Amino acid sequence: PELLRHTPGYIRSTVSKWSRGWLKTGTILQTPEDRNTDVYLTTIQNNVFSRQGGGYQVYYRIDGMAGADIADNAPGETRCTLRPGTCFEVTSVDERHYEWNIIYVTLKTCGWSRNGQSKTPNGDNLFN
Amino acid sequence: SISLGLTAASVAFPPLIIATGPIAAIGMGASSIARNVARKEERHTQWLEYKKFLTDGSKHIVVASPERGLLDFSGNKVFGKMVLDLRQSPPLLHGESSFNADRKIGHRPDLGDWQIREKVGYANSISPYSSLAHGYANSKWPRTIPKIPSGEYDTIILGYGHQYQANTEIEYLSNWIVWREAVPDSTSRHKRPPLEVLNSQCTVIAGERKTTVLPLRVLSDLTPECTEQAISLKDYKFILRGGSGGLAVQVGGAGYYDIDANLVAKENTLSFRGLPEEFPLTFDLSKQTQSVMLKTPDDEVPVMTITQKGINTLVGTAAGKDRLIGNDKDNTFHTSSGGGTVISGGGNNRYIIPRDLKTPLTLTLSSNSVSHEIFLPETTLAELKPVAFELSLIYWAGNNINVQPEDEAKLNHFAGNFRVHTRDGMTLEAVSRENGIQLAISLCDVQRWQAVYPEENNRPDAILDRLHDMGWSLTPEVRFQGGETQVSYDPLTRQLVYQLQARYSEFQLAGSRHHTTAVTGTPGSRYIIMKPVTTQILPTQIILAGDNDHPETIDLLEASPVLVEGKKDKNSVILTIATIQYSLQLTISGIEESLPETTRVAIQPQDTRLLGDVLRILPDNGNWVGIFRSGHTPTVNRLENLMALNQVMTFLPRVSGSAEQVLCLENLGGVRKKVEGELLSGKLKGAWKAEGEPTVPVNISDLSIPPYS
């Protein structure tokens, strides 16, 4: 249970179109009604943080990892399952690497907000 | 809960145009109340029945729903000469109300009861107000013209309202010692009719937006009651004037129509879907004045008389034999599902034809027309038999459209002016061959085709293969519509070009023995070329575009290569790939006429080799030298260097396909390394020593490495 707080989580997603500076601090975000959000605790060699897919690659660092139970995996990999109905607070998005199509997002623990549309104006949902 | 039963679910994308107008009930006029009055009774009771008819005819002259933009004047039975003006923000309603009548003083609304009483003089001035006939000779049952709320209206339902004069008399009731309004006694000489009709007209003047006019449907089937009701109303005058937005008239079934559509408007519909489904319709858009005949036993009755101007979107009946004749301008014909004939005059003409035609439909093409598009919203391409030297739409099963020209001598004309769309999106085109004209495919929308055939694989190669399977002639250049990329193919040269303009597009290519594959790369584009499934595949050609800023990445991990050999010539590198049993070959070219020296090809996950490194080592002459050889060693799957020291917690992910991992410890130092390894999760088979020698077992506790090895 310990590392459920010290170790931060990581997520990678792809978005077709990105708007410059449209995201502001304090925005409420919410995951869709998926069975379990499969997340990878390490990306250094799991090859999930690397560029893959077309468009803009958006990365999340969950400071609050608690509340996720691991699944049956071969001993050697770290994968966890996140329960839906979670509040998410997007912070620190910069596009100095605009041509590389890379978005950095900072996350922390959140409560039971029950709001926040996740579909971008172009229609791409985040946290996939 | 009671209301829930009157609601209907929405239909998404109706393939055809349907009828949406209300159907009139049986016995809407004054005949029914006349029969109810025909029984011998008191005169004042007869008048009371007439007055009740007028009260209901005026109670609901208009129901307005500005939220959905609909106005309903179907309950109009007594408001005659109605005129609706949608140009103003609050629509303007004018008309004539029904009114009482005195044998001598006429109708006098300006007077009170005592004033009319004195004028005719039936009761004493001392008689109470209750003894007098309230509303005698001074009433209008519409009372005040109803006020339409301001709103944005686009659908107008039109009823059949007449203005009536109620001829009445004064009756003395000695036993009740009162005076009442009564029906005239027809037995007394020949008295005036209890209800006399005056006006049989209506008028709508549409605003600037598109307006749909749906008169009440009175001829909705061939039953004797509906037929007789429609024959009665066959002279009702409808005056429609459309706006620049467009006017869509859905004729109710009987009357006189005078449509004045704006020529500026792009689409002016004339829909006959309200008629009986199996109705013989004969219409012509080159005729201003036309009468819609109805065959009653032994006779014909012009159940409609339509005078039209500015119509270009004739819509035929539901499932009847329609004989439509078009205009010298652009036209759009929504034909019925009962077959018939659709002569289309000059200009540009479009036709929408359904599936399961009960009779062969004949399309006559006028000599003056220029272009004809045929839409088949319910027919897929698999149902059409590819007949050569014929434009007719011959179905595999079912009655087939018979496309013919006006003159066969100019049959050669119309080539490339005849596009047959299909529900899957594939578009035929009439291309003239060397000794005739044929229908060949040029356009193919991948999205609709995927929608209609979702289960089967949807790849452009599979698509083209399937078209060649059915034996369909194809245009000299065929284009694929939709998708993240653009695909073109030339049958004359028999070459497939595929352009992935999407940035960092993950693409999968499998060669085929039936076409040469051409790929246009983009910065960051990755091609996932899997293990070939067929042999003797035509050469492949991929072109990169190096911008020296974000290098392209080429990955061949899942190709499972065995031997890859290279050569260069004329600013292009020709590679060949030999799998265990299949073979393929490709040429890398560039747009800038120079092979980029930053582009990286990832042969193995930890073996990413720059194009420059291979580019130097390969001779300028046309000679082949191996660049990748499995014959040297099994496909190394991980390349770990030895600069990392101490605890380094190596994690090697499992793999479904290879089921065998190869980890290469590489020393860049001149000191013989001695690593004290330890297996914590997994098993080892030993260390490689020779290419053709099985894995040599060795203790994982001691791992000695020679320098520079």
mmCIF file of N, CA and C in Angstrom, chain A residues 45 51-55 74-76 99-101, chain B residues 503-506 549-550 649-651 653-654 681:
data_model
loop_
_atom_site.group_PDB
_atom_site.id
_atom_site.type_symbol
_atom_site.label_atom_id
_atom_site.label_comp_id
_atom_site.label_asym_id
_atom_site.label_seq_id
_atom_site.Cartn_x
_atom_site.Cartn_y
_atom_site.Cartn_z
ATOM 1 N N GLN A 45 10.899 2.082 -19.681
ATOM 2 C CA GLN A 45 11.170 0.985 -20.594
ATOM 3 C C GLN A 45 9.911 0.241 -21.006
ATOM 4 N N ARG A 51 6.707 8.354 -28.312
ATOM 5 C CA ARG A 51 5.756 8.839 -29.300
ATOM 6 C C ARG A 51 5.158 7.666 -30.064
ATOM 7 N N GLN A 52 3.836 7.675 -30.205
ATOM 8 C CA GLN A 52 3.126 6.621 -30.911
ATOM 9 C C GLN A 52 1.742 7.135 -31.277
ATOM 10 N N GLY A 53 1.316 6.852 -32.503
ATOM 11 C CA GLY A 53 0.057 7.355 -33.007
ATOM 12 C C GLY A 53 0.200 8.710 -33.677
ATOM 13 N N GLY A 54 -0.891 9.141 -34.304
ATOM 14 C CA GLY A 54 -0.910 10.373 -35.072
ATOM 15 C C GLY A 54 -1.509 11.518 -34.278
ATOM 16 N N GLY A 55 -0.902 12.694 -34.420
ATOM 17 C CA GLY A 55 -1.407 13.880 -33.761
ATOM 18 C C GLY A 55 -0.554 14.347 -32.601
ATOM 19 N N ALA A 74 2.456 -10.859 -15.238
ATOM 20 C CA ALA A 74 3.684 -11.612 -15.068
ATOM 21 C C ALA A 74 4.627 -10.832 -14.157
ATOM 22 N N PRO A 75 5.241 -11.484 -13.172
ATOM 23 C CA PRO A 75 6.111 -10.759 -12.238
ATOM 24 C C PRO A 75 7.259 -10.059 -12.944
ATOM 25 N N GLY A 76 7.249 -8.729 -12.902
ATOM 26 C CA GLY A 76 8.231 -7.940 -13.615
ATOM 27 C C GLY A 76 7.666 -6.651 -14.177
ATOM 28 N N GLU A 99 5.914 21.944 -32.085
ATOM 29 C CA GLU A 99 6.118 21.186 -33.316
ATOM 30 C C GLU A 99 6.317 19.699 -33.048
ATOM 31 N N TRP A 100 6.755 19.336 -31.844
ATOM 32 C CA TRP A 100 6.876 17.939 -31.447
ATOM 33 C C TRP A 100 5.576 17.335 -30.938
ATOM 34 N N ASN A 101 4.513 18.128 -30.813
ATOM 35 C CA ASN A 101 3.194 17.620 -30.439
ATOM 36 C C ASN A 101 3.243 16.879 -29.103
ATOM 37 N N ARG B 503 0.260 13.290 -40.056
ATOM 38 C CA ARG B 503 1.537 13.358 -39.357
ATOM 39 C C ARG B 503 1.629 12.283 -38.277
ATOM 40 N N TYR B 504 2.781 11.611 -38.219
ATOM 41 C CA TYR B 504 3.007 10.478 -37.313
ATOM 42 C C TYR B 504 1.915 9.420 -37.448
ATOM 43 N N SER B 505 1.570 9.109 -38.691
ATOM 44 C CA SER B 505 0.540 8.118 -38.962
ATOM 45 C C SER B 505 1.111 6.711 -38.840
ATOM 46 N N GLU B 506 0.451 5.879 -38.037
ATOM 47 C CA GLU B 506 0.814 4.475 -37.894
ATOM 48 C C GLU B 506 0.132 3.697 -39.012
ATOM 49 N N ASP B 549 14.589 18.331 -39.135
ATOM 50 C CA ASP B 549 14.122 18.789 -37.832
ATOM 51 C C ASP B 549 13.500 17.671 -37.011
ATOM 52 N N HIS B 550 12.493 16.996 -37.555
ATOM 53 C CA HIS B 550 11.871 15.839 -36.913
ATOM 54 C C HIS B 550 12.032 14.642 -37.839
ATOM 55 N N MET B 649 18.427 -3.207 -12.136
ATOM 56 C CA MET B 649 17.028 -3.667 -12.075
ATOM 57 C C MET B 649 16.417 -3.921 -13.457
ATOM 58 N N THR B 650 17.084 -4.759 -14.237
ATOM 59 C CA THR B 650 16.694 -4.908 -15.628
ATOM 60 C C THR B 650 15.331 -5.581 -15.734
ATOM 61 N N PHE B 651 14.405 -4.921 -16.415
ATOM 62 C CA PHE B 651 13.095 -5.484 -16.685
ATOM 63 C C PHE B 651 13.004 -5.707 -18.185
ATOM 64 N N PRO B 653 10.239 -6.938 -20.909
ATOM 65 C CA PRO B 653 8.822 -7.315 -21.029
ATOM 66 C C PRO B 653 8.606 -8.649 -21.757
ATOM 67 N N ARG B 654 7.533 -9.367 -21.407
ATOM 68 C CA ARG B 654 7.207 -10.636 -22.112
ATOM 69 C C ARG B 654 6.762 -10.306 -23.539
ATOM 70 N N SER B 681 13.112 -13.360 -11.471
ATOM 71 C CA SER B 681 11.834 -13.724 -12.073
ATOM 72 C C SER B 681 12.076 -14.097 -13.524
#
